[PDB]
């Protein structure tokens, strides 16, 4: 027997903005210099 997929729920897209080292602060490790804010 094989399996097929039927979609359930959340269809959503995540544009990366920043990745920090600290818990909610600390130095910036990754910064996305492409982001165009709404």
């Amino acid at each position: 027997t094989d399996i097929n997929l039927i979609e359930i729920g959340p269809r959503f897209v995540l544009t990366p903005i920043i990745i920090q080292e600290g818990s909610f602060g600390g130095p910036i490790l990754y910064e996305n210099k492409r982001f165009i804010s709404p």
Binding site: E21, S23, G26, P27
Partner: protein, 39 residues
């Protein structure tokens, strides 16, 4: 025991001192265990 006759006598940490990626100051706290509370 005062040494200089007319001057004033001279006179619970939760973080760890760690060097960060850039080279400044980073604080390391006690890790959280995910044990469920009685309440």
């Amino acid at each position: 025991e005062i040494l200089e006759p007319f001057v004033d006598p001279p006179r619970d940490r939760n973080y760890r001192i760690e060097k960060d990626a850039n080279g400044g100051i980073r604080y390391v706290y006690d890790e959280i265990d995910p044990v469920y509370d009685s309440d």
